Antibody
Framework: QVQLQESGPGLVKPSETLSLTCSVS????????WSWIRQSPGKGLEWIGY???????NYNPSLKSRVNLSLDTSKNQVSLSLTAVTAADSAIYYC??????????????????????????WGQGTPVTVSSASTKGPSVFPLAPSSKSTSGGTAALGCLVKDYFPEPVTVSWNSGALTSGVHTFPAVLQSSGLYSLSSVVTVPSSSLGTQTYICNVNHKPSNTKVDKKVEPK | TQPSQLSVAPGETARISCGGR??????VQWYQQKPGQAPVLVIY??????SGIPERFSGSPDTTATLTISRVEAGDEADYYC????????????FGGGTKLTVLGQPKAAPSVTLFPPSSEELQANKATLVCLISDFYPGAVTVAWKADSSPVKAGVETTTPSKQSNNKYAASSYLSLTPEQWKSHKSYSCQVTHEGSTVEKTVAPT
């Protein structure tokens, strides 16, 4: 059962070398081709390159020869390096398992067939922000459930995740045991250049006395995690 | 390579055109990217479906390669990207520009608005932020205004563009950053969100 997870710095300075890793489980790295693809905000998909254990690698010319891909069999991961980065390199970066096929249009003896590639399993992607600003960890504050926050026996409580940089921030509740009624809002990019987001959970009011609620906030770029207890009043 | 947009009513057939320019035999792949998600392979080699793709999605046989979606539903709204391969070139590195599929005639839904006052922890820290959370609305266009007592608040307002939820409705957020003295001075603060000509106002007060 192939599963991919991209991991990166989340922030890089202009002209630095960007280093990314795709960790794969439920599959051997040597059994497949692998691709990296990226997407700029509100822009399309750009295929970066592909690699195979045979040592076969090939790169998109639009990356300007700045890209290197490699395979680490001991760790079962695919790695990407991108040199001399610019703001134009800010994007979400995906890794994808890549399959190849042959389409025959003629005499096989005349070698009248061609190969095509298709990316059948993608990771969720890792965001990369190219900026000269520093990382900033969030401050997290409780959004207390209150009669103001309550309608008709269901109560809203949450966590405010304020002023962080760069993306992403991850939020779970009660270490992932609490999933139903959880809504985590996309962050806002403030005029300051810092991000803020909120995560709320809708909960039975009856539970408020007897159930404890904790938001788990993870901001990997600053290597900080906060668990915040959210209580009524 | 592909049109940026297509709009369609629920239940009818969407036909999406590739970036095109193929010469000879072709192998076309289609990818589906829904809001806030990673791309998903929907078609390969013109007509082949990976396991799990509905029969509603079909490709065209082997220029002007087409992805057809019959009985379109709201859940089908996405960017659809094609990736065209042909005999001519050893490799095509470029994905199609992509097509934005919009589904029309979805039922309207008024926003639910929840407004949070600053936490006592934030106040203790000499900061104050009001949080206006807006969800479950359709269509996805909203205007957010803030008031201190009855006066419009211009400064310190930060508001997101709406984003689609997995239930096919939309959500957005608005933040008002205040000094604790600004917060304690006024009798109340209000978040007013206007949707389809109608307005829901939520109010909070220092107490």
């Amino acid at each position: 059962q192939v599963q991919l997870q991209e991991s990166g710095p989340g922030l890089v300075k202009p002209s630095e070398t960007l280093s990314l890793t795709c960790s794969v489980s439920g599959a051997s790295i040597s059994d497949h081709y692998w691709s990296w693809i990226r997407q700029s905000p509100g822009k399309g998909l750009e295929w970066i390159g592909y690699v195979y254990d045979s040592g076969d690698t090939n790169y998109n010319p639009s990356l300007k020869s700045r890209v290197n891909l490699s395979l680490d069999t001991s760790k079962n991961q695919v790695s990407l390096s991108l040199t001399a980065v610019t703001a134009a390199d800010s994007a979400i970066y995906y890794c994808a398992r890549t399959q190849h096929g042959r389409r025959i249009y003629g005499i096989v003896a005349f070698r009248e067939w061609f190969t095509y590639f298709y990316m059948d399993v993608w990771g969720q992607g890792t965001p990369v922000t190219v900026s000269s600003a520093s990382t900033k960890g969030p401050s997290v504050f409780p959004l207390a459930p209150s009669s103001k926050s309550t309608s008709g026996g269901t109560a809203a409580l949450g966590c405010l995740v304020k002023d962080y940089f760069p993306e992403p921030v991850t939020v779970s509740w009660n270490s992932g045991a609490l999933t139903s009624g959880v809504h985590t809002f996309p962050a806002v990019l403030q005029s300051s250049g810092l991000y803020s987001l909120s995560s709320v959970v809708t909960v039975p009011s009856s539970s408020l006395g007897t159930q404890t609620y904790i938001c788990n906030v993870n901001h990997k770029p600053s290597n900080t995690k906060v668990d915040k207890k959210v209580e009524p009043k | 390579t592909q049109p940026s947009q297509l709009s369609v009513a629920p239940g009818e057939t969407a036909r999406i055109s590739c970036g095109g320019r193929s010469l000879g035999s072709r192998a076309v792949q289609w990818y589906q990217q829904k809001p806030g998600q990673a791309p998903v392979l929907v078609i390969y080699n013109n007509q082949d479906r990976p396991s799990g793709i509905p029969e509603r999605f079909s490709g065209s046989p082997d220029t002007t390669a087409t992805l057809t979606i019959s009985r379109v539903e709201a859940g089908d709204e996405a960017d659809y990207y094609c990736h065209m391969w042909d005999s001519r070139s050893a490799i095509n590195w470029v994905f199609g520009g992509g097509t934005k599929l919009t589904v029309l005639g979805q039922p309207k839904a008024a926003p639910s608005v929840t407004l949070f006052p600053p936490s006592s922890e934030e106040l203790q820290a000499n900061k104050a932020t009001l949080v206006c959370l807006i969800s479950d609305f359709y269509p996805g266009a909203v205007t957010v205004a803030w008031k201190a007592d009855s006066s419009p608040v211009k400064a310190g307002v930060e508001t997101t563009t709406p984003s689609k939820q997995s239930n096919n409705k939309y959500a957005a957020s608005s933040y008002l950053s205040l000094t604790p003295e600004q917060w304690k001075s006024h009798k109340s603060y209000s978040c007013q969100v206007t949707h389809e000509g109608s307005t829901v106002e939520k109010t909070v007060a220092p107490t």
